[PDB]
Design an enzyme around this catalytic site. Sequence first.
Site, PDB file in Angstrom:
ATOM      1  CG  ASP B  25       4.412  66.147   2.012  1.00  0.00           C
ATOM      2  OD1 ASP B  25       5.528  66.125   2.585  1.00  0.00           O
ATOM      3  OD2 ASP B  25       3.909  67.168   1.490  1.00  0.00           O
ATOM      4  CB  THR B  26       7.017  63.477   6.590  1.00  0.00           C
ATOM      5  OG1 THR B  26       8.084  64.144   5.799  1.00  0.00           O
ATOM      6  CG2 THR B  26       6.979  61.968   6.287  1.00  0.00           C
ATOM      7  N   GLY B  27       6.018  66.471   4.942  1.00  0.00           N
ATOM      8  CA  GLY B  27       6.366  67.906   4.893  1.00  0.00           C
ATOM      9  C   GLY B  27       5.233  68.631   5.606  1.00  0.00           C
TER      10      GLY B  27
END
EC number: 3.4.23.16
Lengths: 99, 99
Positions: B25-27
Amino acid sequence: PQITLWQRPLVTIRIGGQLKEALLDTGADDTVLEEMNLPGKWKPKMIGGIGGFIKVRQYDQIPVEIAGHKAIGTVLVGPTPVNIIGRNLLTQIGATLNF
Amino acid sequence: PQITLWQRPLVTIRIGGQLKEALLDTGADDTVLEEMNLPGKWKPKMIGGIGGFIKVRQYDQIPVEIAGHKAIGTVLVGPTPVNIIGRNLLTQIGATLNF
């Protein structure tokens, strides 16, 4: 592009006159941008977040130009802290995660 | 690998005997896994979420094996709904976003 994640994937996007940046974010299902003045028919959708329920409003075939690629996606406009470009528009500029 | 985002980036990871999957998850800044029984000294850290404050606990040089690559990262263990592997361990298996 090739983005690395040493630091939040902030890319600048253009959506209707309007520019701004938001995160490329494979976390999220949905793209959600801060209050802006899009045209058309919109439904009201309830998104969550520390406290919880926020009412944004859903626009539907809104074009987005993401770091030079065009795309057509359902953008949710509303009281979001940070711009986010879900998997929904991810998919379309044809982003992939690699390693 | 090459992951596409037509559907939530779920990859299975192994962390101490223990396997499970969580989102690439690059969030997120932080990796956060569901209650598991890691060894060592741990600090207590307060993470947010619809309602809000959740107390997970921070383990510090915890190895993680992510879809075959090894990595050493600070994992936050606690009442998380979904496993998540932040940018913090992203960085290390050397993930990049592309398109």
